[PDB]
């Protein structure tokens, strides 16, 4: 993450991020809605950061320092560039909605009233098709990635030294290779929880309650399709094992 965005999302809530004199100007219901939208954006910023650790720290570090066999880095980090493209674009839209809402003279005071339309756009059309295709592929390669990592860490000296070196800093404590893979797999199932709680506090404008209701339904359709398109790939599994599934 870049310093500007980390600082904007450093507080535990929207109510602690904005000036106390700005917070006083809003009703309780608006503060509750804004705290949940802030959590959605803050966790999206962290998710994009997880993908940058996977692409820039791990993947690129292995290509530029180690002599792994061709197709090993791709097996460890399946679809990481496609995942990074989807979520960096989504994060850009979320952060631009916050930026447009800022009060003149402020870099922290804002209220986001129209999140629903952004969520409908992300979870429909070509972008939803690409999310479904990318997560169906990633989650089906999840077990194979973990197994490939375990084998390399246990048998390759230079690979083990590389992992221990880049994961040594305290800021990488929750972000080892397998932890990153599970953080990404679990991201998609966090969206309905966040959207439903934003919806619970968005009844004040009927068009906004309707847009978020449509977005929640689209997110659930996407999750059902991804879940139905998963079959764990296994290195060395024979065709007979596959067609006798």
């Amino acid at each position: 993450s870049m310093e500007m965005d980390e600082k904007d999302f450093a507080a535990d809530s929207w109510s602690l991020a904005v000036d106390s004199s700005f917070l006083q100007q809003h009703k309780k219901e608006v503060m509750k809605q804004q705290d949940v939208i802030y959590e959605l954006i803050q966790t999206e910023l962290h998710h994009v950061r997880t993908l940058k650790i996977m692409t820039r720290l791990f993947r690129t570090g292995m290509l530029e320092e180690l002599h792994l066999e061709p197709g090993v880095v791709q097996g460890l980090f399946p679809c990481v560039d496609e995942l990074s493209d989807i979520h960096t674009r989504f994060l850009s839209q979320l952060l631009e909605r916050r930026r447009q809402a800022l009060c003149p003279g402020s870099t922290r005071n804002f209220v986001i009233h129209r999140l629903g339309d952004l969520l409908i756009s992300q979870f429909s059309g070509p972008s939803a098709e690409q999310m479904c295709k990318t997560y169906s592929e990633f989650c089906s390669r999840h077990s194979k990635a973990l197994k490939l990592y375990k084998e390399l860490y246990a048998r390759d000296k230079r690979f083990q030294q590389f992992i221990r070196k880049v994961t040594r800093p305290a800021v990488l404590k929750r972000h080892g290779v397998q932890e990153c893979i599970l953080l990404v797999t679990q991201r998609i199932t966090k969206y309905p929880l966040l959207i439903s709680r934003i919806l619970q506090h968005s009844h004040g404008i009927e068009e906004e309650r309707q847009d978020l209701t449509t977005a929640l339904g689209l997110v659930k359709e996407l999750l059902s399709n991804v879940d139905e398109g998963i079959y764990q790939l296994e290195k060395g599994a024979r065709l007979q094992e596959i067609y006798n599934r």
Partner: protein
């Protein structure tokens, strides 16, 4: 410090998300209770042994049977949660969550945890449950379910007041360390 992995399972109403948040912060949030939990690596020292315990939630995965098992690989201890204010969450333990955890995590210790123990003597809870011919889960009902499912042990806690929370995670660490 050896690294161990903990996963919490249970129905959406069981309070698993809140439990992980309160333990990771050593505080029940005073301003905003997060909707979700990403992950955390807690530094724990139990009976003289230092451990790095990675914590994971399964919240949001309950309706997706192919996404949910992806949280289980290499788990060292399972916390199987139910809420004391919800006898229906306890009923779903033996034939829904238990067969699943034993299949994907064979020989992994399971600790059955009764959450929201502060609501056992809450008048609103007692009045509400009485309308569906029910009452807050009794400690012996919890112990009996834990015995029945072959749990390593039975414990209770309250994320709201923190009572019992330290004890659950220190016992989970000891269980994760066993042969």
């Amino acid at each position: 410090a050896i690294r161990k992995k903990l996963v919490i399972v249970g129905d959406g109403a069981c309070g698993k998300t809140c439990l992980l948040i309160v333990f990771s912060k050593d505080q029940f949030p005073e301003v905003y209770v997060p909707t979700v939990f990403e992950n955390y690596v807690a530094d724990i020292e139990v009976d003289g042994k230092q451990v790095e315990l990675a914590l994971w939630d399964t919240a949001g995965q309950e309706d997706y049977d192919r996404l949910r098992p992806l949280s289980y690989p290499d788990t060292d201890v399972i916390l199987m949660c139910f809420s004391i204010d919800s006898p229906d969450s306890l009923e779903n333990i033996p034939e829904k969550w238990t067969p699943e955890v034993k299949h994907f995590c064979p020989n992994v210790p399971i600790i059955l945890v009764g959450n929201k123990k502060d609501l056992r003597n809450d008048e609103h809870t007692r009045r509400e449950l009485a309308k569906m011919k029910q009452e807050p889960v009794k400690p012996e009902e919890g112990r009996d379910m834990a015995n029945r499912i072959g749990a390593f042990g039975y414990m209770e806690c309250s994320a709201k007041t923190k009572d019992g929370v330290r004890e659950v995670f220190e016992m989970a660490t000891r269980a994760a360390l066993q042969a």
